[PDB]
Design a binder for this molecule. Structure first.
Ligand SMILES: Nc1ncnc2c1ncn2[C@@H]1O[C@H](COP(=O)(O)OP(=O)(O)O)[C@@H](O)[C@H]1O
Ligand SMILES: [Mg+2]
Lengths: 93, 107, 95, 608, 90, 93, 107, 88, 98
DNA sequence: ATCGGATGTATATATCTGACACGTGCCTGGAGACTAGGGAGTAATCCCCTTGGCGGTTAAAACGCGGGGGACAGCGCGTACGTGCGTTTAAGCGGTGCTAGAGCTGTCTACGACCAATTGAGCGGCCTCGGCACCGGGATTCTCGA
DNA sequence: TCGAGAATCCCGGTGCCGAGGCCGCTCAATTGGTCGTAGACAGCTCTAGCACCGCTTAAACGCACGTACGCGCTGTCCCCCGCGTTTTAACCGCCAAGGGGATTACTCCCTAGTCTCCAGGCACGTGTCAGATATATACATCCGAT
């Protein structure tokens, strides 16, 4: 059966950052679990953010607020920068 | 017209369609915007790149060309930010960061 | 001979560097099964379930022993005593 | 007599409401005799209340003080004798009043004269209570000790222990004549004063009662008594609700409702109804709102010497002004579509005012630390240089100065520089606690003393104070309400002054400071026209038409000059030039400001 | 001298956490000298922790009609306890 | 405007148990927060229980299991008994 | 026909229509069974009654006839069982339990 | 008169006066107190407050408000596992 | 020879009077000033409610009270009856707040 | 102190073996076009409630003192734990035998969502008096030098 | 060393204000319909489990010496406590102004939803190199005798 996961995307990012480094299987499972955990945290916090303000819609503004709430300091700053960049590029297309 | 993925149209590597589908059929809100999958994918990609770069540094520090869970552990625990984001998290087969108290060292 | 304490620090260096499991396998699986025997009889376990249990258990005990060591040092000692375990768990809210 | 005082003072009988017909009916018929246009209330409450219904059921068919009293020390002003006659007459008719002379008219002496009548003529040395603000307690007690020398009048001060001591010893012992107590001491000592059958309750500065639901009003409602003598120097606000509250306290029989009073007078279908019933308001308030004005009674004094200085703005003053403007040009170079926050406007204005006042109010402006006091800062400020020469003119010729600042640090700087000039001073800023405030003021106003100059702030200065031994009242600056400044300069201009009151006013030319006075005068001048005839050629109904734009125009006075770009004073030429320009602006505003009062005439001048 | 059919053997299961294994855990925690009474206290602490986690995991697994505790059940139980665990899926 | 709360029902229960006691406003607000908190805990755990099992419906079984998970020991036992008793009485009526 | 509240049918005191609505409009799931509101109302019922009778006991032990936050604090803290449930909860105006370490007491 | 105007003002953390820490310690059941402990208290309080207020202000930003309501603070606390009962 | 209570007596009387009450222990205006100053570093020009600051004070005081209660155990464990900065550091380090 | 010795550890090398990084087909879910509808964006009102300043009363905070009791350093002593060697035991590995448990695929039907209409449970406002929060005087108790 | 002084619990009367009671506007409950969902079904393939048995090998068990450390005792000294005085700023009562929180209306555009279409990602199978392992050497540290 099909059990989809964030394996190929993680490997794509890896071969982008350290072009000549591999990664074992258990490490990949840990990375996949990490991505799922972070996705769940951000999505849950954004869901509560929409519910607090009586909105039925999740937008990019909710995601940005959630990532500022979860991530600490420098991580939050740089991730907000990256997300703004990607959404701007997507709109201008 | 020839189809183009939303990931490429945004310039990311993570899948924007899959993130959209999960946000929708995950019971988070009634309606899902159009920029939310893009933003979320970009943020996840950034975090993955950060942790993976640190782990690769650590792996090269042991003359190895693969990232094993010990290197993920070392990278996470030696960085003060990822050590806060993953403070309550246990990494299987990660081991312990080397540390012995100075009071215990012999005279 | 090695003066007392010489082998201990070397032993600590050995173990703060490896990653494998420190508790044996069967002595822990037996414990898990007979400790779940009472919540529900006629239970089965996947092997990876028991492995996850052991991973979590050893992580918990290692963190507890680090806190215990800090407690013992704070009392001007180098020997850990059950006093220290009790204090650490009381501080961490578990008791 | 402690025995008779004990017999009379204490609430021997405990009861709630006592009168049924006598007092209420007599008050009503007397008021009906004196232009009884007040039926609406009477039948409204009679219909809605059975008790006053049967009260109305009977309503269908049913020493004049020719001179100052001998006993009180000294004499009284003719208007004072008229006021005491007024109060005596109101007493004879068993209805109260509201003495409301303009401030500084010695109304306290009138109250003490009334009480002297009460004790010495009709012989009721009953328990009189005189609420007041704390600052005014000592002055009261001194007046009792000065005019009617033999009265057991005692303040109610001190911590709980000595308060309880006085209570249980004299008060509950009924061994006094009158009691004095602040607002808070009234609130704290509810029960001891409650268990006294109050002959009178007197209140100085009754504004504090203007709210009907205030806790002090709540408490004062159930003080059993018979007659009240509220006092309020300031004019009564044209709002009607507080007038209802005051009258309600005075005469609960009559003004016993709010909604009925409103529906009768104010809330009308057409506004001309209340415009015409203004005359009936005046009629109803005439009998019991006695008021005199210092202008039309007393000329007992040289009027004023209102002089004005248009000082310059110094080089380092310009430097820090430019610093501020460079920091705050955007919000005043027009605006960003008038999106600038009003708070930002007021803060820019405040920073400009601090720069104009003295460019040491900002840190890092004084030369390198540690500091030394010298003339360096008297020539860092054109204002301070002009003041320095003016002081070294006035002190030597013989005078005493009363500078009023607007903020404390400016008085700190003046203190330090005066100690450099080695003149004895006193500061009475709000920080100075009592028995230290009193210490300083009675040190100054003592007989011949070394304290020459005497420095205050306006908000904490003009409150029941009698600094009259000085004449010149130079102000460092001015505020938005001209009444506060007027009270400040009348700290010295009052009864007893024997020399002309000279008024100086520092104004920084080519600054936001210069626009203040004309903005003040526009506010100032229009007020009087309402007082006399209630209308004029006041076509400038805009009242600056805004505040976000009014203060925007306010800032831009010296906008383009400083932004784009020994030195002795020689005071006499500044006197001449500023007095000529002052009479010029007086003439300009005299013709209703017809040319341009505000006309919302401004444009961006902080371009770049 | 019979009656050997009765088990009368197999000491308690918590004694399978032997003295040197606890020493190994202590050393990985960075502990030089160990008292003699730490062993029993450690056994008690471990037993409490296991009881809590296993109770929650068995709850999860019998909700879903199954009679076999799978790794996902343990992971969920740990997450619910406040101790996220990475690696065994999830 | 419409601001629903459990003050009325908390009062009903209180008069049921201690017939002649009262409750001040602050305690009532605390009890309201308590009820909402427990409701969110139970509902969120039941939502996760349904999601884990691929179901799409929150039934009585999910609420019962979330009660077992959240409440400790003796409370869990009694509260489960209460819930089943009420649901059978409702269903039979 | 004359209506009958589901609260009356179930025999409970908490609302069941309100609980049903909050379950339906809280994104907890796509569909809500018919018996879930009843069960959840019963559980909230039971917990509220438990804590309130403990608080009333404490109020009498303090010789007052009206629960205040301090009494709720005493009921939850003294009771060993609810204390685990509200472990991370801070109750406003609760104070703490009286407790002095015996080592500090005089000899 | 030789004392020049200085106008030095205390840090706001010094408004957590020594007796207040003593009272908090007493309610903690602490008998004898050191003298170096007040700076540690003033230092841990500030950390706690910054971590809470940051999230409260974030929640306020999101709603496009300029008022930090009590519900924002309750949300911020609950986010850190410090649930507060009595304000909503 | 005036009356002096021997050391430790008044400090137990105070423990008893503060463990049997509920009011807030810190002043209110100093705490409010601290709150506004800390918040100034995140958004400029913020308005606060009143229940917001009260909630902050409740959470703050509960936090400190529990922290001191753990510091006491740490101090007693070292066979002292005096709490020193090392005790708070140990307590916070163990709780995971380091 | 210093020096040799004996042990433990880091370093370089050859070997393997098994997991990782690759390519291939294909099928499902992500993308492209299109329609209809309702959520939310924007504007405009409104009045609540925050802010910002003032002055007073009084409790709390700050300061300096005197003194003794607790923290800390030093000494001694006995014990209990560490180090090392010999011995025994249990873990781990492999192999047996069978069977259920658990995860993949279609048809039913009964139960939960939707829409209409309607009333009546619940929310809000407003009162009023009983519990509670003061305030004082009295007996009880508890601490501390004689 | 028990009597003195200070702190506490208890009762009695007072005042006040907050909770509980009562009255008047609105969505849960009634019907009717009807469609997916989720129980039931068969089939199919990989894991667990429960009694064994044989074998290798390291780890656990036990023991004796000794040592250094835990623990108790003593001293000492200085820091923290209780306390009385003086100062300060918090709380409270207050007033005045205006930002902005909350609500209402319209409209329009963006999201859901349907159909069609196609290509990206997933399972399957696969070949080789990264790292683990076992040796031998160099050398780094600890330890005791001098
Ligand atoms: N007849 C008089 N003789 C002497 N001094 C008087 C006389 N009337 C008033 N004063 C003085 O005028 C001053 C006015 O004081 P006060 O009545 O407190 O001001 P206000 O009337 O504004 O309250 C008093 O100090 C009083 O001594
Ligand atoms: Mg006056």
């Amino acid at each position: 059966t099909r059990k989809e996961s964030y394996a190929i995307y993680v490997y794509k990012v890896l071969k982008q950052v350290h072009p000549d480094t591999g990664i074992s299987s258990k490490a990949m499972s840990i990375m996949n679990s990490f991505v799922n955990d972070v996705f769940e945290r951000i999505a849950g916090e954004a869901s509560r953010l929409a519910h607090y303000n009586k909105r039925s819609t999740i937008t990019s503004r909710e995601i940005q607020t959630a990532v500022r709430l979860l991530l600490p300091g420098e991580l939050a700053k740089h991730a907000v920068s990256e997300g703004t960049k990607a959404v701007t590029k997507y709109t201008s297309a | 017209a020839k189809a183009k993925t939303r990931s490429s149209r945004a310039g990311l590597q993570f899948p924007v369609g899959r993130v959209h589908r999960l946000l929708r059929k995950g019971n988070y809100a009634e309606r899902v915007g159009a920029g939310a999958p893009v933003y979320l994918a970009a943020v996840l990609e950034y975090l993955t790149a950060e942790i993976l770069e640190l782990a690769g540094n650590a792996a090269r520090d042991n003359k190895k060309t693969r990232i094993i869970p010990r290197h993920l552990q070392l990278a996470v625990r030696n960085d003060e930010e990822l050590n806060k984001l993953l403070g309550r998290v246990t990494i299987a087969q990660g081991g312990v960061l080397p540390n012995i108290q100075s009071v215990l060292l012999p005279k | 001979r090695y003066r007392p304490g010489t082998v201990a620090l070397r032993e600590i260096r050995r173990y703060q560097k490896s990653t494998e499991l420190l508790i044996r396998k069967l002595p822990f699986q037996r414990l898990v099964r007979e400790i779940a025997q009472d919540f529900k009889t006629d239970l089965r376990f996947q092997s990876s379930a028991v492995m996850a249990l052991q991973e979590a258990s050893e992580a918990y005990l290692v963190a507890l022993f680090e806190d215990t060591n800090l407690c013992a040092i704070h009392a001007k000692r180098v020997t850990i005593m059950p006093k220290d375990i009790q204090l650490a768990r009381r501080i961490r809210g578990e008791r | 007599d402690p025995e008779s005082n004990k017999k009379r003072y204490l609430l021997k009988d405990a009861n709630g409401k006592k009168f049924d017909l006598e007092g209420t009916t007599k008050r009503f018929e007397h008021l009906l005799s004196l232009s009884g246009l007040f039926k609406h209330f009477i039948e409204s409450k009679a219909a809605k209340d059975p008790k006053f219904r049967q009260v109305l059921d009977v309503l269908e068919e049913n020493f004049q003080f020719r001179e100052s009293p001998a006993y009180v020390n000294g004499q009284l002003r003719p208007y004072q004798i008229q006021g005491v006659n007024w109060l005596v007459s109101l007493h004879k008719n068993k209805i109260a009043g509201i003495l409301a002379d303009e401030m500084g008219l010695g109304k306290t002496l009138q109250t003490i004269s009334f009480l002297g009548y009460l004790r010495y003529i009709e012989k009721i040395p009953g328990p009189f209570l005189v609420i007041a603000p704390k600052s005014t307690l000592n002055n009261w007690l001194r007046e009792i000790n000065r005019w009617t020398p033999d009265v057991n009048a005692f303040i109610l001060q001190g911590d709980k222990e000595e308060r309880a001591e006085l209570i249980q010893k004299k008060l509950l012992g009924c061994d006094f004549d009158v009691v004095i107590a602040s607002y808070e001491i009234i609130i704290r000592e509810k029960s001891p004063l409650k268990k006294i059958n109050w002959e009178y309750i007197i209140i100085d500065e009754a504004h504090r009662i203007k709210n009907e639901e205030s806790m002090l009003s709540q408490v004062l409602r159930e003080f059993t008594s018979r007659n009240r003598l509220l006092i309020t120097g300031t004019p009564l606000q044209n709002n009607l609700h507080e007038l209802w509250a005051l009258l309600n306290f005075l005469l609960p029989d009559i003004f016993s409702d709010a909604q009925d009073f409103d529906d009768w007078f104010s809330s009308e279908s057409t506004e001309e109804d209340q415009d015409k019933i203004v005359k009936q308001l005046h009629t109803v308030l005439q009998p019991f709102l006695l008021r005199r004005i210092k202008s039309d009674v007393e000329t007992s004094l040289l009027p004023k010497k209102e002089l004005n200085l248009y000082v310059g703005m110094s080089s380092m003053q310009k430097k820090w002004y430019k610093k501020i403007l460079e920091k705050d040009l955007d919000a005043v170079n027009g605006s960003n579509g008038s999106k600038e926050s009003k708070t930002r406007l007021l803060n820019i204005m405040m920073q400009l005012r601090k720069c104009c006042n003295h460019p040491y109010l900002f840190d890092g402006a004084e030369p390198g630390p540690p500091y030394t006091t010298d003339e360096h800062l008297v020539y860092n400020a054109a204002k301070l240089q002009v003041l320095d020469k003016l002081l070294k003119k006035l002190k030597e010729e013989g005078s005493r100065v009363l500078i009023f600042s607007q903020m404390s640090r400016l008085l700190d700087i003046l203190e330090d520089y005066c100690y450099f000039r080695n003149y004895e001073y006193c500061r009475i800023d709000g920080s100075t606690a009592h028995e230290d405030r009193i210490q300083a003021i009675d040190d100054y106003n003592a007989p011949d003393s070394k304290k020459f100059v005497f420095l205050l702030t306006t908000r904490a200065g003009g409150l029941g104070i009698n600094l009259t031994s000085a004449d010149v009242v130079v102000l460092y600056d001015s505020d938005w309400n001209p009444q506060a400044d007027l009270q400040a300069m009348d700290r010295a201009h009052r009864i007893g002054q024997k020399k002309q009151v000279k008024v100086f006013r520092l104004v920084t030319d080519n600054s936001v400071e210069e626009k203040i006075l004309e903005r003040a005068t526009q506010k100032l001048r229009l007020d009087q026209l309402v007082i006399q005839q209630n209308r004029t050629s006041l076509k400038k109904k805009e009242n600056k038409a805004d505040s976000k734009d009014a203060l925007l125009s306010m800032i831009q006075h010296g906008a383009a000059d400083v932004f784009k770009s020994g030195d002795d004073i020689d005071l006499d030429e500044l006197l001449l030039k500023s007095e000529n320009k002052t009479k010029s602006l007086n003439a300009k505003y005299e013709t209703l400001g017809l040319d341009d009062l505000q006309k919302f005439n401004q444009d961006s001048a902080y371009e770049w | 001298g019979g009656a050997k059919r009765h088990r009368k053997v197999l000491r308690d299961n918590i004694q399978g956490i032997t003295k040197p294994a606890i020493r190994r855990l202590a050393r990985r925690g960075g502990v030089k000298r160990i008292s003699g009474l730490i062993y029993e206290e450690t056994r008690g602490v471990l037993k409490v922790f296991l009881e809590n986690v296993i109770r929650d995991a068995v709850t999860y697994t019998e909700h879903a009609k199954r009679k076999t505790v799978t790794a996902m059940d343990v992971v969920y139980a740990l997450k619910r306890q406040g101790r996220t665990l990475y690696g065994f899926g999830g």
